[PDB]
Design a binder for this molecule. Structure first.
Ligand SMILES: NC(=O)C1=CN([C@@H]2O[C@H](COP(=O)(O)OP(=O)(O)OC[C@H]3O[C@@H](n4cnc5c(N)ncnc54)[C@H](OP(=O)(O)O)[C@@H]3O)[C@@H](O)[C@H]2O)C=CC1
Ligand code: NA
Ligand code: NA
Ligand code: NA
Ligand code: NA
Ligand code: NA
Ligand code: NA
Ligand code: NA
Lengths: 488, 489, 491, 491
């Protein structure tokens, strides 16, 4: 049941946020975001067009070059971010509702995970503002040599629909900590939590233009950000094919890019694993957020000695999953985010059936309505298949037996992807050895799907370029200047 | 200057490629010619890497990265190999400086004192990094050990231009090799000699087979095969902004990390309170160093109105007094440009200048009987939207602009797609740092110009580059950060 | 015209001031109390519980327990960070109260306490709260056979002793860094200035610090102080004060092989070169020594002036000194309050007498001021030589010596010819001179065309006998940690 | 079977061993000399000039001048890096000669001196040579009004005292770091082991070090030693040795507010858990203590064993103990040499006697060995309790105590119940337990499924009474630096 501030918010046209003001599109167009558990329209939103992206970029450029954002001390900047975090925490329940409704995930996990992490991320990054240090370099008695880590300037950010608010925080936390200004676009299907959070940027005291939110569609608002001549740097998270596109376009202006694409991450259960823990880790690893997770462990490699114990257990778990609307207290898994996604993963499940794999559970849709799909366990698979090699992005897992550690490493690494990996073993040497050999940005030994503001994440190979979170994200938003002072 | 015996021996034969630790000819036998730009005579004939050879280099590098000594070796051991390489280059210093003078055209004494000495210092610097490329331990929670590993990216493909051939090979390889990567490297068709000579030293220093692979040839074939290679993990390139676009565009298809150092049109600013004597020398050397074939050349000298007339006079005199000649002639101060193609390209820029109405206060035409030479040139009476004021010429051509206020010169300096470097001349402590902070450029020299060192990073803002070379910074380009979480609950 | 007492201050002062141990406000085990005075009036400001050895022992046991188990030991770094953040928010909420206490107890002007001290306190906790999640060790690539990593672990129970010149802010320098690393604390404010800290204690409780993570033990140097210094179970010591007392602390710490951090005095030089911007340099020179009544480690107590400008600077510092409005801290027109105590006033008056005895000239001030309170007139000495006591020794009063010089090489040699090396300032418009002279001065901090600037992010401390180690900045964290190097065989 | 002397070693020993001060080899000012012995034969190995207080003064003046002016003060970081690298190349070229001196002078087996000590020396200089160009300070973004930056300056003239157990390699730990930062050195080798260092001195001269940058003063603790510790012009001190002497060094340093780095003893525990890999763990336990004849600060002198495995490990260590081939270092079959001196033999035999007196069982060894030279049989004590003197104190001989335990919580408590805290080893195949137990042990270094691993890149040092500070790694550089924070007003 709706919180009064959520009811109030949804009782009207959702404005975009530009130069510190809530505004309609210049051309006046609007679009609809739906509630995926019911298919009804949830809200009507102002539709950012190229001309609006261009007003936003002008606002961001002004805030970066002159005014309080440019003049502020690092402590002052830090306090703004810290105050933002406090405000988000205060509106925690309203934001969790907005995510549960717009995105579809269960309210309680949006609150406990998503919202909670957004808060922590902004607090972490506030801490960095006064610590982005450069170097003094002893080279010669004749010169003072030093580097300055300057903000890159105006940055364009594109956010997908699977962790809407949290992902906005990854991107913004680091960029704002360096002193940049932002032009950010949420996904067409999940613009609500961010647009609601814009009230909190204004209230925390952000100067006008520091952040600008332009909801809209990829090919118009999206592309306007990527192709914009006055945007200094771009960051994107999405499909590998759209990633290729952003990079291609960014080339035209020798523009730095940061991308986090998808994956087909392996979750490995070795013979000496703690089988109880590994099975729960294997199930959560794919099923968390309905499989709508870049780093989902969509390949559970299990040691031949435990294939059957595991495959059984995952089937019983997969059946037990209570599907429902996110705003229902008993819902464990919600629906996918859109009809397009629902089709897209149903078409993977069949494409896989037509390829010869068999279904130990799921493989269809769920409930009377909503963009739902049953949690699905595939069995009898081969490394060359479509469903083994490609990111499905639904709650579908392929389980593969193996007979040697050297084999599982080779097969785990035989992929164009390399976002993440899990390794379950109790042996100290094996766990480090294997994690060392896996070609992925993040490896969890005896766990899976753990993220924190302080630990970087991202892909090797076609899973991305660069890293998000940690100190590391900060380098994406900086231009290093080397100053030499002749003191001969 | 007389040829060294080891140079003579080297040029007395077909110049071979280096792949998998062996000197070899192109698989299909093709060869090409490199010239002596001061004479136009062929200097040597070289084996010509084709796509298939790049394929062989890449497989050798893949194998040396995945298994064998370079993969097993301690950081100390890798470091010592790199240190032994530097000692060897130092030993062959005179031979290498000769090759560079003959093949590139620059004067022998500066190749020795500058290029070859910097190459040695860069490898020594980077050897020191092997044992210090540290990751982090991150305290987050009592229930986990969190740590990062900075792993070498793998096989890296590198393309270097022709203006600082040996040194630029060192910028690239120093950092890559320090992280544990393996290299497929392509020198410019115009200047493959110093690199291919130096290959001997990689072998003798004890590099294992395939750790480094040198494939000379042409951009459209050898270059493209590197850029497009499915098994090359990361690429680095130095050159024109236009080819840079190409490289990044191509790298997109594989989600491949890029490092680029492109051109510039760097401002060199003389403020009113500058030590005008030192400023004049810095202005002149900032453009004329290496015949202007320098990314960071101070190609736009901005001069406070009060001093404009005075420094234009001096740069004109200095221009007209430089001794043009063959690099291997001891009286030479400036050699020719690198190729007929560059000589015409630059000449074309000067014509466009005159035609756009700028004045030629000095130079403006070719020099001597043969060779790709161009007279030092000073353009005057110029304006911000002129082709010559805005575009990288890459020859010994300067454009001199007067200005009236500091806010003005900052704005006009920054009004460019480029942002590689800048010079600021002032004796005031506040003005010098204030102006340096406001310039959009990777490197600013206060009361100096054109200084590089292994320890200080270099690169561009805007369309002058992505990423940095030199210093600790370069290392981040050759690494993949891995975050490991160990549940200890 | 009086600044009106804050109701919460009045309430605080209306009762015995308790100490803080294991999360509770308590009296001393033996019931002793001591008096703290208002140095402007000489009246008693409050009666405060006096910590004895037995009380330090109780605080150390509490701290030990909070470090070894309990929430502080189990909390994530984010959670520890949030505690620090909220404590800085509470400090800010009580900004006026805490500034009135500084003014009343220490003597300094209220507006300065507010704008400087309290605000710096707040920022210092905010800064350090940011470091909690960022205190990182290394992964070291050595060999394929081993995973090599280091951990920067909190050293443990830390003993901290704070002087009286910047009471609250000094407590924050000490505690912010240490708390950021996960340490637990036993801290002693100065006998003369225990109030601001004991009031602050309400705020540590309110923010939610677990029991015993911080422990405040007011009292005397020889009983409470020495008990901290000499305690078998305090893992590390931090101190700021006199160079003589510093020696004692290090000598005692030798017996347990205990890491020590110390910030001691100085005789910092403030150098005006020929090409200085004279108007800015005169103001810097005057504030450099007069700020906080000269009760400042880094005070530019030696003003070196290039021969050309010497007389011009002397005349200006004389006029400025004579124009200072002295008065109580809690009075709005006050620009410079009294010295912290009778003993300190007597100490500086003696130094002035020595200066006169030794042949120096009192160009201005040089005696006590007003009817009541520990006041001393801002003082300017001329006709001094390098071998004089007043030029070599820390006075810790609003007293300055002015010295002319003829060359840069000379001033650098004279500035460095001292046992001290806390700070220096250099005034010159020339880019090369600025940096060259900063490079040559043996001081932990050098201000070029400024003076007395401090920030949470920038380290502070002494060369030579001005100290060991640094406070503030990232640097201050390493004094609070032990480095553990872990080798994991992965062969 | 004797290892044949190298011509150069024979030529060196053929004469009086000179000291090295201001780039030249010279006699003591007062003509005094002392004898260093060969601990396997008890014969005099060489006569060496004995540095007095007057000699140390000469060395300090030389180092001071080298630090303040001349080539070392003007060299670029690359140039100073090159000197370090060349020195390492020279050490490598004389590897056999240096390993022979170590064996002869210290008594350790030649092959070990070679493969270990002398190769670690080389690598240690190569490592620190690489740091020369990378000792960076910070640019700190604080305000648009200022450029804030720090400089990590060399502290200056550093006094270094090194013991006799790893002569040459210890000199390298200390000088590598301190030389990388740009400091100058006054170093003293142990009375008993001056040869390898004085021989090495030729290499510093040959590598091209400027006059005075390194100065070697061999002699005695209470004369040459104390004079370093007490010199007014030495800016920092570093010492390795006994707790008791460490206390003295820190007490003396207090007088000048001088930074101290100390590595003292330990009683390190080597823990074998129930799921350990027993074969690996037994070898590691045995080597953990027997390496270098037990003359090792980090020696696993307390072998803790899980009850299940206690008797198996005891029998195994008894058998290995009695199988070691004792002999001269210069004899090819030698596995363990003598102790360094009659005095050290008398001390360890004393300890063994006390062990027997307090009720412990000598399961093996426990007496002297051979007919001449300072040998002691590898010894294994059982039937031991935590409060015995041999369990608590550092023996510094090839003596070990074996103790069973029944829970992991118990062994952490017993291992940590010590004033020492140098190192620990943990043997277990479980990923969780390894890290957990490593995290809870209070030791500077923890090896998981190994023991006695050292590397230039990894820090080493003690918690508690085992020391202050760290050596090796990037960390060791901080000990040789003074941090200067520069503020440039750019308003
Ligand atoms: N900042 C700098 O240091 C440099 C800037 N430039 C800029 O470029 C201008 C023209 O010179 P130009 O050499 O034509 O510039 P390009 O950018 O085309 O070439 C730069 C280098 O890249 C190689 N190359 C060319 N095409 C490809 C390709 N498709 N794939 C991979 N590699 C390729 C060339 O090899 P090859 O020589 O074999 O053809 C050359 O060594 C110069 O006047 C200057 O403005 C050029 C060089 C360096
Ligand atoms: Na929606
Ligand atoms: Na990639
Ligand atoms: Na050529
Ligand atoms: Na008081
Ligand atoms: Na000191
Ligand atoms: Na001896
Ligand atoms: Na200690």
């Amino acid at each position: 049941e709706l919180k009064p501030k959520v009811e109030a918010f949804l009782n009207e046209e959702i404005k975009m946020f530009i130069n510190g003001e809530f505004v309609s599109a210049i051309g006046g167009k609007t679009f609809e975001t739906y509630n995926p558990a019911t298919e009804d329209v949830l809200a009507v939103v102002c539709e950012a067009q190229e001309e609006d992206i261009d007003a936003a970029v002008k606002a961001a450029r002004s805030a970066f070059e002159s005014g309080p954002w440019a003049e502020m001390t690092t402590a002052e900047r830090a306090h703004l971010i810290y105050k933002l975090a406090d405000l988000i925490e205060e509106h925690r329940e309203e934001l969790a509702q907005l995510e549960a409704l717009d995105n579809g995930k269960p309210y309680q996990v949006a609150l406990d995970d998503d919202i909670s992490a957004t808060v922590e991320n902004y607090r972490y990054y506030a801490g960095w503002t006064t610590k982005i240090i450069g170097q003094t370099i002893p080279i010669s008695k004749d010169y003072l040599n030093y580097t300055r880590h300057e903000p890159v300037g105006v940055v364009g950010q594109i956010i997908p629909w699977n962790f809407p608010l949290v992902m906005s925080s990854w991107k913004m936390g680091a960029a704002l900590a360096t002193g940049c200004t932002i032009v950010l676009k949420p996904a067409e299907q999940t613009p609500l939590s961010l647009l609601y959070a814009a009230k909190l940027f204004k209230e925390a005291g952000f100067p006008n233009g520091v952040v600008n939110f332009v909801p809209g569609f990829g090919p118009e608002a999206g592309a306007a950000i990527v192709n914009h001549h006055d945007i200094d740097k771009v960051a994107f998270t999405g499909s590998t094919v759209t990633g290729k596109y952003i990079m291609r376009q960014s080339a035209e202006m020798i523009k730095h890019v940061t991308l986090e694409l998808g994956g087909k991450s392996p979750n490995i259960i070795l013979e000496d694993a703690d089988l109880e823990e590994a099975i729960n880790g294997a199930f959560q690893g794919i099923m968390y957020n309905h499989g709508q997770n870049c780093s989902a462990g969509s390949r559970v490699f299990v040691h031949r000695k435990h294939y059957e114990t595991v495959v059984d257990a995952l089937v019983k778990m997969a059946n037990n999953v209570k599907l429902g609307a996110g705003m229902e207290k008993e819902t464990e898994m919600g629906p996918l985010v859109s009809k397009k996604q629902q089709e897209r993963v149903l078409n993977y499940i069949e494409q896989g059936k037509k390829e010869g794999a068999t279904v130990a559970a799921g493989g269809e849709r769920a409930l009377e309505k909503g963009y739902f799909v049953k949690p699905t366990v595939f069995t009898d698979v081969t490394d060359d298949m479509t469903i083994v090699k490609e990111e499905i992005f639904g709650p579908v897992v392929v389980v593969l037996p193996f007979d040697s550690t050297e084999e599982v490493i080779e097969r785990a690494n035989n992929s164009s992807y390399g976002l993440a990996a899990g390794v379950w073993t109790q042996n100290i040497k094996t766990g480090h050895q294997v994690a060392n050999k896996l070609k992925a940005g993040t490896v969890w030994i005896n766990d899976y799907n753990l993220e924190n503001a302080a630990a970087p994440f991202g892909g090797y190979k076609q899973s991305g370029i660069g890293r998000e979170l940690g100190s590391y994200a900060l380098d994406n938003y900086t231009e290093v200047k080397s100053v030499w002072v002749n003191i001969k």
